[PDB]
Ligand SMILES: CCCCCC(=O)OC[C@H](COP(=O)(O)OCC[N+](C)(C)C)OC(=O)CCCCC
């Protein structure tokens with residue numbers, strides 16, 4: 001149950017993500033991400049894009065049906081405080097791309113937590129344009145400490161939860177529609 005590892009899908013839950021958060025230690029903005037693949041298809045790491053912050057974790061290479069991937073990120077430790085904001089892309093065995101947005105901002109006087117999930121037709125790389133589409137134009141969800149469900153097309157749907165604070169968790173279950 002460390003970031004960069006793949007666990008039994010059933011084992012993913014809040015406490016696992018809070019354990020991931022806690023290992024990043026004391027930093028004002030960080031996120032632990034859990035994505036449970038019950039899509040009925042194998043995913044293969046494509047990449048992560050960071051609009052703000054970083055991760056030192058390498059995306060788990062393969063996430064089979066029934067596995068969850070664990071991942072994390074944190075703000076930089078430089079002088080110009082940013083948050084942790086980005087997009088993870090996995091290719092699915094159907095030839096399409098699973099994309100996940102997270103946004104844990106620094107200055108909560110102006111911004112709040114957001115996340116999103118979407119399947120892109122075909123192979124697509126996580127990048128600035130994908131972040132923009134996902135943050136500004138694809139009805140992202142609030143990190144409002146509630147669950148949000150959404151049909152993805154392609155025979156798939158998602159159910160996910162993000163909390164509202166600067167120490168963030170994001171848990172997403174991708175299942176069959
Ligand atoms: C305090 C007003 C916020 C102005 C908007 C902005 O771009 O600042 C937030 C920015 C990015 O903040 P971040 O929390 O990482 O993300 C804002 C959320 N997004 C990127 C999703 C819009 O953080 C900085 O660039 C620090 C200010 C520059 C000092 C030289």
Ligand SMILES: CCCCCC(=O)OC[C@H](COP(=O)(O)OCC[N+](C)(C)C)OC(=O)CCCCC
Nearest residue numbers: 105109110111112114134135136137138139140141
């Ligand atoms: C007393 C402050 C009033 C509160 C400001 C506010 O409601 O924030 C709106 C917006 C936050 O909007 P955003 O994260 O872009 O919109 C959330 C909705 N989505 C995710 C769909 C784009 O922030 C800004 O762009 C301020 C720019 C500061 C420049 C100094």
